[PDB]
């Protein structure tokens, strides 16, 4: 069954207006990636898996920046977040990776030969 992997405070830029919101967002290990205004049923206001995903990292114009980038059938997906410090963006850019590698793992073992 589905365990979370870490949950805590992100500021989130927004997709049409590009402003920081914080969320509270859980990452769980089958992938989902759910984020509330508050913590936590009340809807989340974003949910995405985080499979087959990749993370950047900048520091424009925002340090400490990722950015979570999903290709997927025609359209590239990125959602963008923000944390105070540079080992704070390693524990969540860390978290995410290693899902997402788990995830690719298991894809390998079903598609391969």
Request: aromatic residues 12%; neutral net charge; proline residues 5%.
């Amino acid at each position: 069954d589905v365990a979370i992997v870490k949950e805590g405070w992100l500021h989130k830029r927004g997709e049409y207006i590009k402003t920081w919101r914080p969320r509270y967002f859980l990452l769980k290990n089958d992938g989902t990636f759910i984020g509330y205004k508050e913590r936590p049923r009340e809807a989340p206001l974003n949910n995405f898996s985080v499979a087959q995903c990749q993370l950047m990292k900048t520091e424009r114009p925002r340090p400490n920046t990722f950015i979570i980038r999903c290709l997927q059938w025609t359209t590239v997906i990125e959602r963008t977040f923000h944390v105070e410090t540079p080992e704070e963006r390693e524990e969540w850019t860390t978290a995410i990776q290693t899902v997402a590698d788990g995830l690719k793992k298991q894809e390998e073992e079903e598609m391969d030969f």
